[PDB]
Write a protein that binds this DNA or RNA. Sequence first.
DNA 1: GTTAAGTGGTATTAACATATCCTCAGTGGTGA
DNA 2: TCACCACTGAGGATATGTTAATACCACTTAAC
Length: 140
Amino acid sequence: KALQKELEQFAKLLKQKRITLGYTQADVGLTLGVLFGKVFSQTTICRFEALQLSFKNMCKLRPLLQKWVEEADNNENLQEIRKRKRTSIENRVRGNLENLFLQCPKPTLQQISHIAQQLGLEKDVVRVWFCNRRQKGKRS
DNA sequence: GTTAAGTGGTATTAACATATCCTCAGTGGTGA
DNA sequence: TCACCACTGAGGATATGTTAATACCACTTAAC
């Protein structure tokens, strides 16, 4: 209910403290990583300050930012002194994988290993990309 | 026979590439 | 021979589109 407006007020004050403290959003992610271990990317901080993330995510990142703003005010010099690695797919690999579809929608792990070795991609990367391919094709 | 773990299936989540934009530095047309 | 504001480009820093990656849940399967 009013949690929406309370989050919004917190986010506006958070923007004000970030601008006052002279920290970039990438620097905010770096500080969160070096003070908690869960380093976040600057896109998440952007979507936070603009209030773009979902409600559950909104509540999930509320406490970390609360702690950072309540702690970093003491000393900055010592603080100044674990990403969800997300490998990209280049266009020719994308085209080759699309070619691998339209014939066998759900390949076996035996074929998955061959596909991974053929295009030089990690097995887990190819497996998750295959799952998301199925997912977006089943959307429609 | 019951209960905990593995397997998928689908919803959320969060980072990448590139698209915009802020701000500051470098050059100069015009004026004095 | 001086000012300077206008004018614009560069790099860093934000907003987007988009999709790897994880995470939550129903179903089956293995252990005592």
